[PDB]
Design a protein around this motif. Sequence first.
Motif, PDB file in Angstrom:
ATOM      1  N   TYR A 202       8.228  -1.173  11.692  1.00 40.13           N
ATOM      2  CA  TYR A 202       7.918  -1.497  10.314  1.00 40.13           C
ATOM      3  C   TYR A 202       6.467  -1.214   9.968  1.00 40.13           C
ATOM      4  N   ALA A 203       6.207  -1.149   8.667  1.00 45.63           N
ATOM      5  CA  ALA A 203       4.843  -1.151   8.146  1.00 45.63           C
ATOM      6  C   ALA A 203       4.798  -2.055   6.929  1.00 45.63           C
ATOM      7  N   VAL A 204       3.616  -2.594   6.662  1.00 44.56           N
ATOM      8  CA  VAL A 204       3.365  -3.417   5.482  1.00 44.56           C
ATOM      9  C   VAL A 204       2.444  -2.633   4.563  1.00 44.56           C
ATOM     10  N   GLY A 205       2.886  -2.392   3.336  1.00 44.50           N
ATOM     11  CA  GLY A 205       2.082  -1.641   2.385  1.00 44.50           C
ATOM     12  C   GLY A 205       1.695  -0.287   2.943  1.00 44.50           C
ATOM     13  N   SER A 206       0.419   0.057   2.805  1.00 44.27           N
ATOM     14  CA  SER A 206      -0.091   1.335   3.280  1.00 44.27           C
ATOM     15  C   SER A 206      -0.582   1.246   4.721  1.00 44.27           C
ATOM     16  N   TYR A 226      15.973 -10.665   6.366  1.00 42.21           N
ATOM     17  CA  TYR A 226      15.600 -11.687   7.349  1.00 42.21           C
ATOM     18  C   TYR A 226      15.178 -11.010   8.643  1.00 42.21           C
ATOM     19  N   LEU A 227      13.925 -11.226   9.033  1.00 46.78           N
ATOM     20  CA  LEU A 227      13.314 -10.523  10.157  1.00 46.78           C
ATOM     21  C   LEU A 227      12.568 -11.512  11.051  1.00 46.78           C
ATOM     22  N   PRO A 228      12.144 -11.065  12.246  1.00 45.50           N
ATOM     23  CA  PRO A 228      11.460 -12.011  13.133  1.00 45.50           C
ATOM     24  C   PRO A 228      10.202 -12.600  12.498  1.00 45.50           C
ATOM     25  N   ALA A 229       9.879 -13.830  12.879  1.00 43.46           N
ATOM     26  CA  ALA A 229       8.770 -14.553  12.283  1.00 43.46           C
ATOM     27  C   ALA A 229       7.448 -13.798  12.370  1.00 43.46           C
ATOM     28  N   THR A 230       7.227 -13.071  13.456  1.00 45.53           N
ATOM     29  CA  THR A 230       6.006 -12.286  13.612  1.00 45.53           C
ATOM     30  C   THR A 230       5.884 -11.240  12.498  1.00 45.53           C
ATOM     31  N   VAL A 231       6.974 -10.526  12.239  1.00 49.76           N
ATOM     32  CA  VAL A 231       7.013  -9.469  11.230  1.00 49.76           C
ATOM     33  C   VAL A 231       6.789 -10.055   9.836  1.00 49.76           C
ATOM     34  N   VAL A 232       7.501 -11.141   9.559  1.00 53.53           N
ATOM     35  CA  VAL A 232       7.442 -11.780   8.259  1.00 53.53           C
ATOM     36  C   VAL A 232       6.045 -12.339   7.979  1.00 53.53           C
ATOM     37  N   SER A 233       5.419 -12.928   8.992  1.00 52.55           N
ATOM     38  CA  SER A 233       4.055 -13.431   8.849  1.00 52.55           C
ATOM     39  C   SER A 233       3.097 -12.279   8.546  1.00 52.55           C
ATOM     40  N   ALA A 234       3.263 -11.152   9.237  1.00 54.88           N
ATOM     41  CA  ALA A 234       2.407 -10.001   8.993  1.00 54.88           C
ATOM     42  C   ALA A 234       2.536  -9.494   7.549  1.00 54.88           C
ATOM     43  N   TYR A 235       3.749  -9.513   7.003  1.00 47.61           N
ATOM     44  CA  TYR A 235       3.952  -9.125   5.609  1.00 47.61           C
ATOM     45  C   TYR A 235       3.236 -10.085   4.658  1.00 47.61           C
ATOM     46  N   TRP A 236       3.538 -11.375   4.747  1.00 49.40           N
ATOM     47  CA  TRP A 236       3.045 -12.329   3.756  1.00 49.40           C
ATOM     48  C   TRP A 236       1.543 -12.573   3.866  1.00 49.40           C
ATOM     49  N   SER A 261       4.620  -2.985  -0.568  1.00 48.86           N
ATOM     50  CA  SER A 261       5.880  -2.479  -0.059  1.00 48.86           C
ATOM     51  C   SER A 261       6.082  -2.897   1.399  1.00 48.86           C
ATOM     52  N   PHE A 262       7.300  -2.695   1.873  1.00 54.60           N
ATOM     53  CA  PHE A 262       7.644  -2.930   3.262  1.00 54.60           C
ATOM     54  C   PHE A 262       8.471  -1.746   3.733  1.00 54.60           C
ATOM     55  N   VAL A 266      14.186   3.926  10.771  1.00 53.84           N
ATOM     56  CA  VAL A 266      15.534   4.306  11.178  1.00 53.84           C
ATOM     57  C   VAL A 266      15.324   5.544  12.030  1.00 53.84           C
ATOM     58  N   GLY A 267      15.393   5.411  13.351  1.00 52.10           N
ATOM     59  CA  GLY A 267      14.972   6.503  14.205  1.00 52.10           C
ATOM     60  C   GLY A 267      13.555   6.905  13.827  1.00 52.10           C
ATOM     61  N   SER A 268      13.327   8.206  13.672  1.00 53.45           N
ATOM     62  CA  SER A 268      12.016   8.695  13.258  1.00 53.45           C
ATOM     63  C   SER A 268      11.805   8.644  11.741  1.00 53.45           C
ATOM     64  N   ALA A 269      12.838   8.264  11.001  1.00 50.49           N
ATOM     65  CA  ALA A 269      12.757   8.196   9.553  1.00 50.49           C
ATOM     66  C   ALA A 269      12.257   6.837   9.087  1.00 50.49           C
ATOM     67  N   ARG A 270      11.908   6.774   7.811  1.00 47.09           N
ATOM     68  CA  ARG A 270      11.302   5.586   7.247  1.00 47.09           C
ATOM     69  C   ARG A 270      11.920   5.299   5.884  1.00 47.09           C
ATOM     70  N   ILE A 271      12.307   4.049   5.657  1.00 51.29           N
ATOM     71  CA  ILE A 271      12.803   3.586   4.362  1.00 51.29           C
ATOM     72  C   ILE A 271      11.758   2.645   3.791  1.00 51.29           C
ATOM     73  N   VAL A 272      11.313   2.946   2.576  1.00 53.45           N
ATOM     74  CA  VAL A 272      10.295   2.143   1.912  1.00 53.45           C
ATOM     75  C   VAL A 272      10.914   1.234   0.862  1.00 53.45           C
ATOM     76  N   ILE A 273      10.726  -0.067   1.039  1.00 50.74           N
ATOM     77  CA  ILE A 273      11.154  -1.068   0.071  1.00 50.74           C
ATOM     78  C   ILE A 273       9.967  -1.331  -0.857  1.00 50.74           C
ATOM     79  N   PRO A 274      10.060  -0.949  -2.138  1.00 50.94           N
ATOM     80  CA  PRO A 274       8.944  -1.245  -3.039  1.00 50.94           C
ATOM     81  C   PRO A 274       8.663  -2.739  -3.145  1.00 50.94           C
ATOM     82  N   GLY A 275       7.402  -3.093  -3.370  1.00 54.67           N
ATOM     83  CA  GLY A 275       7.032  -4.483  -3.486  1.00 54.67           C
ATOM     84  C   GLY A 275       7.861  -5.270  -4.483  1.00 54.67           C
ATOM     85  N   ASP A 276       8.179  -4.665  -5.627  1.00 52.63           N
ATOM     86  CA  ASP A 276       8.902  -5.412  -6.642  1.00 52.63           C
ATOM     87  C   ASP A 276      10.291  -5.843  -6.158  1.00 52.63           C
TER      88      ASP A 276
END
Length: 330
Positions: A202-206, A226-236, A261-262, A266-276
């Motif tokens: 995963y990545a958070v924003g940029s 719903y993701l592991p607490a470590t990931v979710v903390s890094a986002y928020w 965004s978050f 998916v393998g080497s690919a990336r799906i970007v969830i916009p912040g909104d």
Amino acid sequence: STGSATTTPIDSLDDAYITPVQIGTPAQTLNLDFDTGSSDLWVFSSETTASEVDGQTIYTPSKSTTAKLLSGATWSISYGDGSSSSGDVYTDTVSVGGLTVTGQAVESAKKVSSSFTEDSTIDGLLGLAFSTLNTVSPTQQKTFFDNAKASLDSPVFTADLGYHAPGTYNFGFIDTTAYTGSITYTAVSTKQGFWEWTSTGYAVGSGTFKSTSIDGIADTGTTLLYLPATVVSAYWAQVSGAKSSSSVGGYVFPCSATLPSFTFGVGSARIVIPGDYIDFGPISTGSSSCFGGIQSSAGIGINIFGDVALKAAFVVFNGATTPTLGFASK
């Protein structure tokens, strides 16, 4: 054969999506919540306890010339959010977007929990996980997809959920106009009955991408991510004033915030969830505290790629002999 149906958010937050389904002869059209995290097709019905029906459209098997009681069969299900329902079973003709299955198990609710009663927009569920999770006893029943599969042009269905807009469920074909770039396919474990897969990170924003394996399920019937607490903390941590609230039941953030965004791998690919997509609005009417769309899976026991994640992608549920999942940007 193929089928194609539009799926529509039930409210302004995309809390769930409903898809019209024709049941019986003459057709009775009910708006069902297509749920890739469960495996029962159940409906509000003429058998549902009257006080537990509040605005839903009901299936009345006695008015369907093709309905047959499945003698002795009962069902009972409890969902991860604590809701539940139970009843008996008919077989009948079920069509979705022009695709017809005869002899589909239609599970008629005698009882539903309050959360179902209180949601007038959802007339039942159509499960699209693996049939091993189906709750009918003493003879387990097949999902709509499992019944249709052999007849389909290709043994697949696709979910193309909209953000604050309608989308599409297709059966039997991949609409190559519905996504950009390529579809990246990834392995599925069916061991728990789910479309279970492993994200590559995963990545958070940029921010920089963190390569890490995240096992979870593709679940159209769950609203949030719903993701592991470590990931979710890094986002928020990237949202000023965001905090986990035990009283509210998760991460909340100031409604004045602009959410990052978050990205998930998916393998080497990336799906970007916009912040909104991560904004679920005021915790209560008029509040300036807003509910987050990324929440911890701790204590669920599984990570869930729910609608927040899936609506950022065109998603292929490949039901070939060895199932796989495909994700494309769109």
